[PDB]
Every structure is written in structure tokens, then in C-alpha cells.
Amino acid sequence: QTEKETNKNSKLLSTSAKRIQKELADITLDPPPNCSAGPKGDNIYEWRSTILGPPGSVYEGGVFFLDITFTPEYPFKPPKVTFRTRIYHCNINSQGVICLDILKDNWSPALTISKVLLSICSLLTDCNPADPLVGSIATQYMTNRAEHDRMARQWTKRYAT
Amino acid sequence: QTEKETNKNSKLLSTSAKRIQKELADITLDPPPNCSAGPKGDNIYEWRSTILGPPGSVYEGGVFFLDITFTPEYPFKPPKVTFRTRIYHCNINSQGVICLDILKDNWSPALTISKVLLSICSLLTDCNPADPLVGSIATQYMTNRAEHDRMARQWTKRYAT
């Protein structure tokens, strides 16, 4: 009777849309210091964000653009957040993918895009060489911090100004 | 400045959902003869359909199940309609894919799932050997109709009863 047989998501769409609209209101009213975000256009699932390099960090003076993409499975799956602007950082690769716990295994539906951006700012201030996406940058941070920071400042001026 | 850069659909979701709900009401009130359809569950994009073999056809007495899947691009892209129940028919393959003009290049957004099902019934009554998906069945229809129809009746009894 298996022999008789030959060989997008309504509910999740409704829940994700409800959450995203709430988060938009929240981040507009109470944005994280140095960061803004909102829809690029008519599609509520695709946002842009601007982050200013944190004061005192090697990224100070930079203006960085991020793409934030929600799936219909939001908030049960994390948003996809990538840097569009090139940045020299051991946790952020050439595709702009960010190694941040809460964007992967440590995501919880209770987290907000405001909390995610705050966390990304914290990562720009204090990188995490224990979990790098760019090995050479992480080893350089550990072994030749002066060169690391010179390069990070140079890339900030070159690509983020 | 391209050098500065690193290397689901709100609007369509709203339009597709509006259309699908209207079509559901229509097909419930005024179903095509010998056919029924509606959502399998909570997801409005995934429907089931039952088609009875058309009277007088070699499929008479069969009860056939179809999967109908809408995309967020509906009605601008056609629904995906496949037979779940095995059927011996030159326009319907072993994956249940149906060779019907209106399901591919001849789709228009004005067409309804009621019109699609009517068309599928017409195809079960009058197959189209000019555009087959199963070559051997089409050639057999042309050259040995008696064997074709014997086999179609046998497969109806075996898999659709």
C-alpha cells in the first residue's frame, strides 16, 4: 500500500510577522547606543542596520552596514546577521558572518534584535579569540596585538569611512 | 567602493494568503464534478485533493489523491499539483508530475484551483500523447491502445481502489 503511492508556512508566517513588527517599534523607540535598524523596503523580513564603531575601540570612526534577515521560523530560529562593510576582526569573516554565540547555538526566542546589536557592539569592543572565524587574525591578536590593531584601524579608515 | 563590501517575502505572503482563502471558499461551495480539495491542516499553502476517475474513462472506479502546494508567489506562479496515487497515464509520471499546459508555461493568475482540477479531469478522459511525460505509455497509446487501456484499468484497480 506504500506501493500505491508515487515517489509556504501559514502559522509560522503569522507569528514571525507579529514579532518583527513589535521589535521594529522597540528598536525605533529605544535603539542601542551607536546603532540603528529597520526594514530596507516593503519586505518586513529584510532589514538594514548601521553600527558606529564603538568609542575607544580600534573601529572608532567607522560606519558599518549590516544585513539582518528574518526567516518565517523567527523567533524560534535566529535572525541571520552579517556585516556588509569589510571589517578586520577575528570573529567576523570575509562574508561578514559573525561568530557570536547568540546567533547560533545560544539563540533564545526571548532575545531581541536590540540585544543582538548590543552584543555585536560588545564584540567590536572585546573580540573573542577563543572562538575565531579568521584564524590568522586571532593568532595575530594574541601574538602581535600592535600589528593587529594597526591593521584594524587601517581597514576602518579604508572601508568604513 | 565595491571594494568596501564583504562577499521571507512580506508582500507576496499577504497577497497569496488572500487569494488562497478565496479559492478555498469557492471550491467548497462549487467543487468540480468528481473532485474535492482543501487544506491538509493548519498550513493554508498545503492542500489535499481527491479525484474520482471520470465516468467512462479507463480510470473509472478509481479514487486518486493529489497534493496541491501553493508558493508565496501564487497566483503569479502556478500551484504545484502532483498525483500521490500511482496512475498509468502518458501525461503523469512516477513522481506524479502532470504534463498540463496550465501548470507550466500557460499558467495565468486568473486561473483557479477549480479550473486546474477540471482540466486534470479532462486529461484523465482525453490524454495528450503529443506532450507525454512517459514515452512508453504514449507510444503504446498510439500503437496498441487495447494493451494501453487494459494496463490503465489494471493499475486503477491495483492502486486506486
Swiss-Prot record, chains A, B:
Pathway connected to this protein: Protein modification; protein ubiquitination
Pfam families the UniProt entry points to: UQ_con
Family: Belongs to the ubiquitin-conjugating enzyme family.
This protein's name: Ubiquitin-conjugating enzyme E2 E1
Active site (catalytic residues): C99
Residues in UBC core domain copies: 15-161
UniProt cross-link Glycyl lysine isopeptide (Lys-Gly) (interchain with G-Cter in ISG15), position: K104
Quaternary assembly: Interacts with RNF14.
